[PDB]
Amino acid sequence: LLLDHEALSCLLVLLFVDEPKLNTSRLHRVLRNLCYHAQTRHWVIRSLLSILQRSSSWLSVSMDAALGCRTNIFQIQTVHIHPQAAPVVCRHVLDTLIQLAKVDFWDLLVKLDNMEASPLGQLMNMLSHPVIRRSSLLTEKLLRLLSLISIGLTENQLQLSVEVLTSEEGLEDAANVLLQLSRGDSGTRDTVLKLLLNGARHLGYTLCKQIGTLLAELREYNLEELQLPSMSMLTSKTSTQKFFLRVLQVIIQLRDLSLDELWDMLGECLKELEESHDQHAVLVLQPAVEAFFLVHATEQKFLRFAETHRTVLNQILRQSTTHLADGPFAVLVDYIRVLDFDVKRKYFRQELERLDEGLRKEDMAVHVRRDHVFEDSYRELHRKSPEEMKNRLYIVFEGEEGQDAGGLLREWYMIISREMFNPMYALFRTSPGDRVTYTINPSSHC
Amino acid sequence: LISIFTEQELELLISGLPTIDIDDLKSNTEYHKYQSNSIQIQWFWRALRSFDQADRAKFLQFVTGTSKVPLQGFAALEGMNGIQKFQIHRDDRSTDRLPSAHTCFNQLDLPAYESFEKLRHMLLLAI
């Protein structure tokens, strides 16, 4: 017991006072080193968690909380933290707890002034408490903390509400929490799956209500660009589309939800947007389509979808920078009639670069004679490896001046593409019918 | 990885999409049983103007057998029997079958489809 609880309380009072100068990372490393002693760790953490619960004269610390309001952090009359200061005391305590997760106090505090896995339950209850539930920052920090610690029913309901209600990094840490909890017990796996499904069904029902208003207002717009106000609650960053897609991506991550009333009206809505002669107007349903192809096309109905909306799914993919074979729409790699040429060209070029991404490519010389380029290139390259061919060739013509290497390479490709069809090599001959095409010369055995 | 392209699209990937002067093609079109002011022909030209560059190129391959644009223009469009202009023929068979091509004559047989939408759908389904 290197330090007593009064010296620890004096150190912990530093978490309440918000001073920018104070080195709180150094204070965190002091508390971390002190917390190697298990009884000290246990008292420190039980105090920090009592500070969170109490967030939800020497001790005269005036924090500027709002305009014209300089609050006292402590109200002592049984010691309470003034709710204006509370969110900062929470933020500093969660900052300390994140380090302790990488690795009585009140009565002592008034005595001065007068002169991992178990408390995970408290930290999951903390999500219900208003100063935290308000603050996206405190929620993100608490979720990072839970994502570290994870390495019951209400506590999972409160963890899922973090996804069904409003932090992309904090909700990816929430995904980590929900996974690592499900790794724990088959019963928590099952209960979190079924409560995810419950939330996704709520989201689907209200999404079908919203798209039903959208479709109805598109009916009333046409029957007489698209800036339908019903669109605002789909464009919104916190739209049920993004919540539904997030929840489905977590469901599919836990797998290793019957809504045909949604899917068929997403159908007729997309069809009525496409018939309404506007194009990006579809994109307010892109995440609902991505949900469709998540829930369907399990690692069919999605194929009839890609047929009846073919040009729509193409508008989606062409607009999306999501790489076709890394996004959800990868399944249709093999059903290729449902994509545009330039979409397939991008997929081609990205998958080619992905397969050869491990290869460092160098520059590579090709020394040729202007009068012999074809045979000099054959000699130079025909024994080269494919990966040496994949190097960028720059061509040097003997004694010629320097010139733009790109234009000189383009010229080189042009001359070669000619010489392919010089009859002296007997490689290609014109179709006797067309007379402008070329096919293998069956007389190349000469 | 190449098998994702069509037999048209591999050509369009290797040699690129040509820029088609539809005015040059129209100037070098021969109409045999259709006429230049037939409604199905105005629908044909409207469709071909409405098609993007890849479907236009796929059409050119369908009717000429290639995506290659003649340097001198379509007046110099070759066929099996010397310079042959592009040509549209009315297909007097039933109008529930696609147009058909005889690329050595640069010949299109085109049923008298009853509407712009159906003609566009059938041509796009052919290409």
UniProtKB/Swiss-Prot annotation, chain A:
Task: Please tell me, according to the UniProt entry, what happens when changing residue 410 to Q.
Answer: In MRXST; increased protein levels in patient cells
On modification after translation, the UniProt record reads: Phosphorylated on tyrosine; phosphorylation is probably required for its ability to inhibit TP53 transactivation.
Q: In which tissues is it expressed?
A: Weakly expressed in heart, brain and placenta but not in other tissues. Expressed in a number of cell lines, predominantly in those from colorectal carcinomas.
Q: Which domain of life is it from?
A: Eukaryota
The protein's location, in the record's own words, is: Cytoplasm; Nucleus; Mitochondrion
Task: State the associated disorder.
Answer: Intellectual developmental disorder, X-linked, syndromic, Turner type: An X-linked neurodevelopmental disorder with highly variable clinical manifestations. Common features consist of moderate to profound intellectual disability, delayed or absent speech, short stature with small hands and feet, and non-specific but recurrent dysmorphic facial features such as macrocephaly, microcephaly, a broad nasal tip, deep set eyes, epicanthic folds, short palpebral fissures and a short philtrum. Patients may manifest other features, such as hypotonia, seizures and delayed bone age.
Q: Which family does it belong to?
A: Belongs to the UPL family. TOM1/PTR1 subfamily.
Physiological role: E3 ubiquitin-protein ligase which mediates ubiquitination and subsequent proteasomal degradation of target proteins. Regulates apoptosis by catalyzing the polyubiquitination and degradation of MCL1. Mediates monoubiquitination of DNA polymerase beta (POLB) at 'Lys-41', 'Lys-61' and 'Lys-81', thereby playing a role in base-excision repair. Also ubiquitinates the p53/TP53 tumor suppressor and core histones including H1, H2A, H2B, H3 and H4. Ubiquitinates MFN2 to negatively regulate mitochondrial fusion in response to decreased stearoylation of TFRC.
Its domain comment says:
The HECT domain mediates inhibition of the transcriptional activity of p53.
Q: How does it assemble?
A: Interacts with isoform p14ARF of CDKN2A which strongly inhibits HUWE1 ubiquitin ligase activity. Interacts with MYCN, POLB and CDC6. Interacts with isoform 2 of PA2G4. Interacts with NR1D1. Interacts with AMBRA1. Interacts with HAPSTR1. Interacts with HAPSTR2. In hepatocytes, interacts with PAQR3; the interaction promotes PPARA poylubiquitination and STUB1-mediated degradation.
Its recorded name reads E3 ubiquitin-protein ligase HUWE1
Per the UniProt record, the source organism is Homo sapiens
